[PDB]
Design a protein. Structure first.
Ligand code: HEM
Ligand code: HEM
Ligand code: HEM
Ligand code: HEM
Ligand SMILES: COc1cc(C=O)c(OCc2cccn3ccnc23)cn1
Lengths: 146, 141, 146, 141
């Protein structure tokens, strides 16, 4: 379901309040904690063996930042998301072979992390808009599987 | 399968919901209906508008069942027997809808109890709701 | 989907032995028995109360032959499975709101049915070819979800 | 969650395996590696080749593992805790792979045991294999 003018305004409004050097790190870190098999994709990243270990790993926070940045891009280019993530699709699908269900999980963890931070400001209607967005990034990301 | 830490995580986290359980049930419900409009086809007889009394009442039922699942976390299949007959035999809910509702419950909790919603507690709660979902979508009678 | 000339020959020879009046009904019947929530889409088929009821239900068989028939059309159009199924994708996705996970399930059920029928003739290489096909077909069903 | 019937079906279907335990185990293995090549990434130390004595010996373990899981179905988590730690803690097997192996086991069974592969038994094996899959992918001790 595409974006109507009201929610477009709503999501971009609160994306501006997002701190761009943490939430990405908490989203990835929570993905690695809540869905631990995803760790396998990061043996290069070192210590991931406990939550607090994960949630402070400088690699993780570092990596997160560029994932959030990837998300920012999709926001700016909703009308054509698959083009945006064309290259990303290739790396994740063709190179690493990440099962695309894992994409959906990360989008939902990011949505959780927006709720954690923004609290009551993350209303059901603003979640509804964001759920449209993340499902776009997950779908665009697996386009090469299709 | 829940670990010892999972169990303690969930019970202390739930105890913090306290008197807001029913309220959190109804909000998770509303979030699911707005976020995932296909789930509405399961409630064709519900008034689904904002502030709906039917949704508020149903939320309380769902919250109370989750509370009882917490009380009975070691023997959930027996404790949830009647709910699995309803959901697995009569309604035949698609399991993907339980993942949507569980996600919305975790969004509600993170929005309302940020200090409780640590990464570890997040994981424990995710496993608990997955376990409840499996029982409710499994025909074991 | 790209099959080799060899898996092409072996798939087509097996399919030429398929009982076009039963295999479809067996695959659907099993889907409904193995994944009971799929029964919600077929309330107008009558008795689905037990496995023996499911498999003997005449509407189940009727609709199974139709579904088997689409998998045939796909087998002659492995090239643009997307186009060949564009209309069918319209139905299950826009009209019917079938969660695309169920498309994978029925293709795998159908794979189990061919194994059941053909035994040792359904070799690992042979199944590998069919997996390619039903992965292809399910993809083209979920094209509109894309 | 398995029903009474389910455990009887799984016992009555998997028992007929018996002698050919290694054979069917190795074949479902091979079925998985050919049909779903990404799954080889967990087996770079194996000889993947057809008829590989390492795949065959492995097949014998998964099957006994599964017969062992059939043997302790009602306390599978305790009975499988060592396999859990292998696959969930040390190997980090993504759970989709368990669905692929479970499919290939069902195919092998349908190919070799048609008279046992009634719709009812197929539903039970699928649940049993989903149950093993959850236990093997969960960190619970
Ligand atoms: C779903 C939304 C996702 C987005 C937007 C995203 C974005 C990105 C980006 C921008 C990179 C750049 C790394 C580079 O330039 O080399 C990357 C790399 C990577 N992604 Fe993701 N990613 C997503 C999902 C996932 C998931 C779910 C996994 C695994 C469970 C994953 C595994 C990886 C790995 C292993 C790398 C490279 C690791 C490294 O550089 O050391 N990705 N991703
Ligand atoms: C946390 C997971 C869930 C729990 C604990 C739960 C709990 C409940 C409870 C306690 C009832 C009332 C039983 C009664 O009044 O006799 C109920 C009814 C119902 N539930 Fe669920 N449910 C869950 C997930 C779902 C999902 C995902 C759906 C559909 C998307 C669903 C659909 C229904 C429906 C349609 C009814 C009938 C309500 C009515 O007709 O008034 N449930 N459920
Ligand atoms: C994955 C491969 C599938 C194929 C090739 C397939 C094929 C078909 C065909 C040929 C039709 C009839 C179109 C017509 O005669 O106009 C149809 C309709 C239908 N399909 Fe399927 N199908 C698939 C999966 C599914 C699944 C998984 C479900 C539900 C879980 C489903 C639910 C339905 C329903 C409800 C109808 C219409 C029934 C009615 O209106 O009476 N399909 N499909
Ligand atoms: C029903 C599902 C499965 C069962 C019952 C099972 C059972 C077993 C058993 C019994 C062992 C050897 C235990 C021992 O050392 O004595 C083993 C090892 C192993 N399994 Fe699994 N397994 C299953 C699924 C999987 C899947 C889906 C994968 C990966 C895609 C996998 C990868 C491995 C690996 C890599 C080993 C190491 C084996 C070795 O080095 O000997 N397993 N499994
Ligand atoms: C339909 O898919 C399912 C169904 C069930 C039931 C399941 O696990 C049950 C289970 C797991 C682990 C431990 N236990 C103790 C008692 N029961 C269990 C997993 N997947």
């Amino acid at each position: 379901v595409h974006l109507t003018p009201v929610e477009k305004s709503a999501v971009t409004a609160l994306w501006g309040k997002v701190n761009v050097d943490e939430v990405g790190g908490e989203a990835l870190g929570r993905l690695l904690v809540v869905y631990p098999w995803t760790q396998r994709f990061f043996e290069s990243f070192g210590d991931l063996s406990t939550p607090d270990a994960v949630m402070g790993n400088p690699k993780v926070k570092a990596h997160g930042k560029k994932v959030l940045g990837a998300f920012s891009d999709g926001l700016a280019h909703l009308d054509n998301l698959k083009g945006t993530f064309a290259t990303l699709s290739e790396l994740h699908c063709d190179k690493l072979h990440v099962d695309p269900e894992n994409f959906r999980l990360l989008g939902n963890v990011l949505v959780c992390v927006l709720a954690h931070h923004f609290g009551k400001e993350f209303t059901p209607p603003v979640q509804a808009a964001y759920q449209k967005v993340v499902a776009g990034v997950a779908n665009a990301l697996a386009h090469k599987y299709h | 399968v829940l670990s010892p830490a999972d169990k303690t995580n969930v019970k202390a986290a739930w105890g913090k919901v306290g008197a807001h359980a029913g309220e959190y049930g109804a909000e998770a419900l509303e979030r699911m209906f707005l976020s995932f409009p296909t789930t509405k086809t399961y409630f064709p007889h519900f008034d689904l508008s904002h502030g709906s009394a039917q949704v508020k009442g149903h939320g309380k039922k769902v919250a109370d069942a989750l509370t009882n699942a917490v009380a009975h976390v070691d023997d959930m299949p027996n404790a949830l027997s009647a709910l699995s007959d309803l959901h697995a035999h009569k309604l035949r809910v698609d399991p993907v809808n339980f993942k949507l509702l569980s996600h919305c419950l975790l969004v509600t909790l993170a929005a309302h109890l940020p200090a409780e919603f640590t990464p570890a507690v997040h994981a424990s709660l995710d496993k608990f709701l997955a376990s409840v979902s499996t029982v409710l979508t499994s025909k074991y009678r």
